[PDB]
């Protein structure tokens, strides 16, 4: 319905060639994607995908 979409941060790496860190994240269904995440997010955090 109006549920939330979250993903646990499995892996995190600061790449000089990017302007936000890159994270391997695991969504609810167990699928893992590489995405950008805000500075300050660390391995073991949970990020939320939200509509602005």
> Is 10:26 a contact under the CB 8 Å cutoff?
yes
Q: Which residue has the tokens 């302007």?
A: 19
| Minimum CB–partner distance for residue 16 and a copy of itself (Å) | 13
* Residue 14 engages a copy of itself in binding (rule: CB under 8 A): no
Task: Please give the Cα distance from 42 to 23 (Å, whole number).
Answer: 9
Site for a copy of itself in 33-52 (CB under 8 A): 33-41, 45-52
* Residue 27 engages a copy of itself in binding (rule: CB under 8 A): yes
Eight-class DSSP state of 43: T
* Residue 29 engages a copy of itself in binding (rule: CB under 8 A): yes
């Amino acid at each position: 319905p109006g549920k939330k979409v979250v993903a646990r941060v499995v892996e995190l790496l600061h790449d000089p060639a990017r302007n936000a860190p890159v994270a391997r994240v695991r969504f609810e269904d167990g699928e893992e994607r590489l995405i950008l995440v805000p500075e300050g997010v660390k391995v073991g955090d949970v990020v939320e995908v939200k509509k602005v």
